[PDB]
């Protein structure tokens, strides 16, 4: 359509507007003190967050200009979720710095690109100064700092996630999900816990309990669905032999073989088990594949090439346990060699490596999770739904923060790392003034996190910010109880992933933005 | 080695003319399947309503035009094809 | 639709003021100095980009007469991005420059069409010029530098495009994708490397990195589809006899073949894994010919003549090393005669010639590629969407102007091979005085390039522009470092065909826009 | 700069059936010098219709060149292989036009070749097809999207005869479209 094309300061004052109405929604989620921010939905009721990345995300302004800076910043805060899951309100604030303060080198006559180059450069060595000024976060006391921190200065929800993350280790995966009451509760199931139920009711050993309790039982595992008894007389009568009991892993079983399975369980003759094959395809496959090393069986396939009506004891898998409910079943000791479980593992972790979807990455993590080490849901409690959204927001933050703190480390919370960053710094240099101009502009704006932090507690930024300089190591501003201490013996730990991604997203986009000159958009 | 039962012939069906009778290259469908074929055994004979069996009058060694159809079975001895049919399906014989 | 009608000068100034807006949106990205400009997309983030083609293609007016010349403009810098692939700024630069001079000329009362046969005079003459004034563009530092001027000055990028045809040569083909990382990286492939993986999980030889891989194996091309495996138990039994492993290429293996390939591959009798045949309809057919020459083997096809059960060995290709995965399959030194791989690309090279799309072209490149040199892939890293986006776009910009360079040759950058050529043609005359003035405004015009790059750096356009026409052949002036010198001993070269290119469709379609008497649009 | 490309004689825009015709793998064409030209109106499948005109032409030994609304499958596959076999050589390139308008330029095809057009309506069939009834050209030359006949061997007066009626058509036409296909 006919478009609206705005040139060098108006276009520039008009992106800037944008992206300080986005910031300005934003951060005033900042530090302990930051407050909440309602965004309005089209369905259902109001949501209250924290989150800058949700802030961010609903800003869209009427001006078109403006509305273009704020979807430019917004991209710092959508990235900067994505990658670390944390540390989205310090990328805003860090962009908008950047960018008021590149905007000001800008409109003094300074190149825009050199002063680009010159941002790139800071954060860069920024960055390097981050790696080197992290320290290692592998013990459960730092771990719950780090969670504490993340979730608002929320003390349960950090040992809450260094429980889940000691009883999970380092292989295990932990998901946040609803919980019906009004406390946190950790569910943490070990090996292998798929959730498919019981293909019949009436397969229940213990009816008290409504589950099947089969004590080291045979597994078998067929990829092809069953509806016929006569694939399996062989297996079954074989089982009946050896008298244990048995469960079954198909595709489905249903008609007359369920029914035949169903009336050997009343006669007591089999102890007879049939639950369906976790997971759908080219990846029902797989989990069963690790159902069968995990238990020290071989799955039964055409495409392998063997039949049922061939299989034996030693093709059916060993388990020391199995529970069957009507969701989910469980395998407890599965006979597995340790060395084939290994293996699987390794397989498990190059796909992961050379996958590209977090989805998939994600479910590879969990079938890793159901072979080594656990699964823990992390239910949230709250009283009402508005209460559930933002501590489930906040733990998942926590959540993400944490793993990104052992992935990296931690460092001074507060924006203490960035401004020790900035001072380390102090001498960098480009290849001319104006490159000089965007590493000082790149250094200022290393001290607008603590800045906004300090804003948002309602003391003085500039005079906080100050003090924080003047002290060396880890001394920074506890902005809860407002006082000043160590960093870290005050509990206040940052992962260094989520302060170096804020800062390269934020420096990146800022960058970009104060490099434009001209703007075409569409006319109002 | 496999001899047939009664009025049945095993017979070898001989390789599809590649070539036209101008030196024309068939290929697919255009070089069909061969209905004649060289008898490779004869069973014992048909058998009559009053008990006498009587030999068939192909004999073996004997190029035979066959009809193809639910008659002729395709059954393989040592990797090879080996027609089994009736000998009412065997509609002539090739002398010469 | 009901028509507004402007005659005369009425119409030239809303055309020139529609030329004027999309030429000035465009011209701000103009040199080392040029800015960036924000596209707002109504899809997805704004855009920041510096190509001219990009802000010439968004340019669109609420004035009828303004877009028809804004439309008109715009096809220099679409014409010259789908020729060359670089100087659109240029191209607009000069198209708007002698549109300003020609219409200055037209309201002097010179007859139109004389102005438009002087301006092509000059430019015939100044392609001419252009030709005589190149040199080879041969070595790496040479293509490095080109690389370079074209990504904006980025050094990187130059030294990766060079390497990259370094490694595939005149034949390979080279191609830019997003990266992952926040660093370029190059991955060259030789030979063959269809991405088409195993058809089938367990062929794996290799399960810690998850490839089947073969030694000095067989190949059997099939160009029909096999679900049965009677039609290769000769080729499969003989592959088993000489023992050496063997590679399927078809258009799909499936059911009671595939299985059976499977089965043997566990049983350990012969090594068989099957892919699926690269490409499609009438590319398909293609590919398996191209494989077979350089594997020296022949395809099994209905229509070729042969069928599956007379295969043989002589039949079957053979190759060093055979690598499959999940997604590419490599076949490494391919035994074949190297006529028929020379021959075969000869024939790939005709079907260039006479091939009329850019897809086919590209594809039968891409073939070529396969056959002799290599593929490479240049991996864009940055550190959010944006400057993915910005970063590919100055990437693809340099591997164009690389090409062109390596094609027609360089000239001195920064807009001194025009003014050298404006210069050479001071003594160029025509018919009568209007195409003399027409070969005059061509020849000013020729000076835009340099006059809006040394604006573009806040320098005076008209000081430089004199300083550098006083000087004599390569010297000029160095935009980033603000200084006079040699442009080739600087590093700044701009491709031959981009600059011819740039030149001659500005020319011809300013030309045909200050011919213009009437203009005819709807009605607001 | 402006081009100028002048094709005589007969050049209607039809390639090859199948890429194995070619003879000149360098220049991607079909060549055949002084072939029989034949020239039917139904489409071909199946063989058995041509083994008279097929063998006849492999005993002549000059190369043959089909015209016809669609040779595929079982036919290509044979005259292709036997291309490969130099027994015969066979070029088949599709009829061109469409309805009402392939029968005339085939009748054009066959009285500037001196031939006869196979039809169904015509009377005649391809297995009664002759050297006689196929035409003759001194040259064929076959590209993927052109077919060229050189100076076709056919007698004068049924040229000047042909194009007078294609000019009779010419002034009976009344759309500007027909006028310029008969021209
Ligand atoms: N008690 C505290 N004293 C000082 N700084 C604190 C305190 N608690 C948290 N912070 C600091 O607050 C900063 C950001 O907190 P917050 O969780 O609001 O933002 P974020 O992690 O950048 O973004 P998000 O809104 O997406 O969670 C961190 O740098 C952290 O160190
Ligand atoms: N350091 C430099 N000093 C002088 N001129 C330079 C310098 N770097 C680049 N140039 C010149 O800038 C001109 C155009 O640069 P730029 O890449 O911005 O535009 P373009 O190639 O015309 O178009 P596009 O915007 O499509 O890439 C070229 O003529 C080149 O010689
Ligand atoms: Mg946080
Ligand atoms: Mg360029």
Redesign the interface.
Same mark, same amino acid.
């Given at each position: 359509a006919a478009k609206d094309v705005k040139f060098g300061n108006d276009a520039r004052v008009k992106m800037l507007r944008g992206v300080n109405v986005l910031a300005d929604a934003v951060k005033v989620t900042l530090g302990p003190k930051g407050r909440n921010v309602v965004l309005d939905k089209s369905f259902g009721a109001p949501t209250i967050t924290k989150d800058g990345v949700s802030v961010a995300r609903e800003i869209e302004l009427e001006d078109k200009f403006e509305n273009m800076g704020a979807q430019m910043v917004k991209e710092v805060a959508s990235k900067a979720n994505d990658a670390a899951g944390d540390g989205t309100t310090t990328a805003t604030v860090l962009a908008q710095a950047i960018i008021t303060e590149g905007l000001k080198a800008v409109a003094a006559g300074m190149n825009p690109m050199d002063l680009k180059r010159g941002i790139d450069k800071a954060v860069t060595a920024a960055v390097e100064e981050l790696k080197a000024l992290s320290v290692p976060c592998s013990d459960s006391k730092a771990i719950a700092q780090v969670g504490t921190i993340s979730a608002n200065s929320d003390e349960t929800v950090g040992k809450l996630i260094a429980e889940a993350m000691d009883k999970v280790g380092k292989e295990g995966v932990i998901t946040v999900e609803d919980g019906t009451g009004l406390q946190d509760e950790l569910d943490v199931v070990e090996g292998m816990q798929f959730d498919r139920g019981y293909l019949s009711p009436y397969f229940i050993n213990k009816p008290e309990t409504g589950a099947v309790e089969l004590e080291s039982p045979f597994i078998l595992l067929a990829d092809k669905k069953i509806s016929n008894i006569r694939e399996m007389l062989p297996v079954l009568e074989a089982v009946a032999k050896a008298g244990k009991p048995l469960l079954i892993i198909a595709e489905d079983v249903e008609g007359e073989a369920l029914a035949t399975l169903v009336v050997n369980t009343m006669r007591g003759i089999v102890k007879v088990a049939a639950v369906k094959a976790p997971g759908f395809g080219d990846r029902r496959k797989a989990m069963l594949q690790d159902i069968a090393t995990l238990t020290g069986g071989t799955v039964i396939s055409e495409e392998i090439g063997m039949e049922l009506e061939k299989a034996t004891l030693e093709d059916l898998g060993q388990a020391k346990r199995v529970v069957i409910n009507k969701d989910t079943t469980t395998i407890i000791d599965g006979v597995g060699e340790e060395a084939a479980i290994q293996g699987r593992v390794a397989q498990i972790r190059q796909q992961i490596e050379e996958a590209t979807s977090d989805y998939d990455r994600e479910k590879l993590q969990e079938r890793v999770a159901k072979l080594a080490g656990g699964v823990a849901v992390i239910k949230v409690g709250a009283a009402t739904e508005v209460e559930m959204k933002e501590k489930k927001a906040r733990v998942e933050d926590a959540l993400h923060a944490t793993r990104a703190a052992v992935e990296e480390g931690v460092v001074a919370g507060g924006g203490v790392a960035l401004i020790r960053v900035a001072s380390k710094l102090a001498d960098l240099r480009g290849q001319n003034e104006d490159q000089n101009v965007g590493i000082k502009v790149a250094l200022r704006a290393m001290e607008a996190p603590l800045r906004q932090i300090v804003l948002n507690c309602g003391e003085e930024p500039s005079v906080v910010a100050n003090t924080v300089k003047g002290g060396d190591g880890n001394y920074g501003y506890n902005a809860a109880t407002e006082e000043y201490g160590n960093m870290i013996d005050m509990g206040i730990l940052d992962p260094t992933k989520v302060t170096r991604s804020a800062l390269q997203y934020a420096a990146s986009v800022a960058g970009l933005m104060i490099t434009t000159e001209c703007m075409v958009t569409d006319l109002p | 080695n496999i001899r047939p039962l009664h009025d049945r012939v095993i017979v070898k069906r001989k390789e599809v003319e590649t070539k +036209?009778? *101008? *030196?024309?290259?068939?290929? *697919? +469908?255009?070089a069909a399947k061969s209905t004649r074929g060289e008898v490779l055994a004869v069973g014992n004979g048909r058998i009559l309503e009053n008990g006498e069996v009587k030999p068939l009058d192909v004999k073996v060694g004997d190029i035979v035009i066959f009809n193809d159809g639910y008659g002729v079975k395709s059954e393989k001895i040592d990797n090879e094809e080996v027609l089994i049919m009736s000998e009412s399906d065997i509609l002539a014989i090739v002398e010469a």
């Open positions: - | +036209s009778a *101008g *030196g024309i290259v068939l290929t *697919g +469908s255009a």
